[PDB]
Amino acid sequence: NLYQFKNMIQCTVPSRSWADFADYGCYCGKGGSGTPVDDLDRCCQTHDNCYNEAENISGCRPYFKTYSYECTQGTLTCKGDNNACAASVCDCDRLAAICFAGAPYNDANYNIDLKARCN
């Protein structure tokens, strides 16, 4: 669920407020269309697409599905007690959080005008 994804982000990028990732580029955040503006936005585009695929599973709601995971000693691990929905959503959230840690952050790309720039 969203709260868990936020916690993955806090765990993988502890130098920055999780909020920095909540509204960035065309995809990190509310937006989900257009050309990704940079590497970090591409992390978010892949994540968005991953959620759309997981949503095809009956009863699978990626923003709301509570999965089973651990973040300890620098490592994310989606646990074995996850069903197919939980495992898929956890994995989306896992590789996104890892992606964020290696991505440059461009202050210009925070809070951009989706209507104008993401068609």
Partner: peptide, 6 residues
């Protein structure tokens, strides 16, 4: 991410 919590 997303802050579309509810």
């Amino acid at each position: 991410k997303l802050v579309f919590f509810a």
